[PDB]
């Protein structure tokens, strides 16, 4: 069996120009490890960016699933 948090989910990241980028990942991934893959897809570094889900900033150490980030969940991207 593949347990909860280790199936592919596709998270939608939304920038300040209304562009969407889809990142395939696992619910068990930390926000930090999510940012690492995101950054390679969008041409930045994790330390240059902030992610928010519906108003609140996501902390690097905490998992996507703990923030209730699921397949097709939208996140808002900001650059420092």
């Amino acid at each position: 069996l593949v347990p909860r948090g280790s199936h592919m989910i596709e998270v939608v990241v939304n920038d300040r120009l209304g562009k969407k980028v889809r990142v395939k990942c696992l619910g068990e991934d930390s926000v930090g490890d999510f940012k690492k893959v995101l950054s390679l897809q969008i041409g930045t570094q994790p330390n240059k960016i902030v992610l928010q889900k519906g108003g609140s900033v996501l902390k690097d150490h905490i998992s996507l699933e703990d923030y209730e980030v699921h397949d097709q969940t939208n996140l808002e991207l900001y650059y420092l």
């Binding site: 199936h7 889809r22 990142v23 395939k24 696992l26 068990e28 991934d29 490890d33 893959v37 390679l40």
Partner: peptide
Amino acid sequence: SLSIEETNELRASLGLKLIPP
């Protein structure tokens, strides 16, 4: 913007657990 296969190349490089097929 990327397939599971391509995403996994990135994950593997970063030492993360792979996304199941």
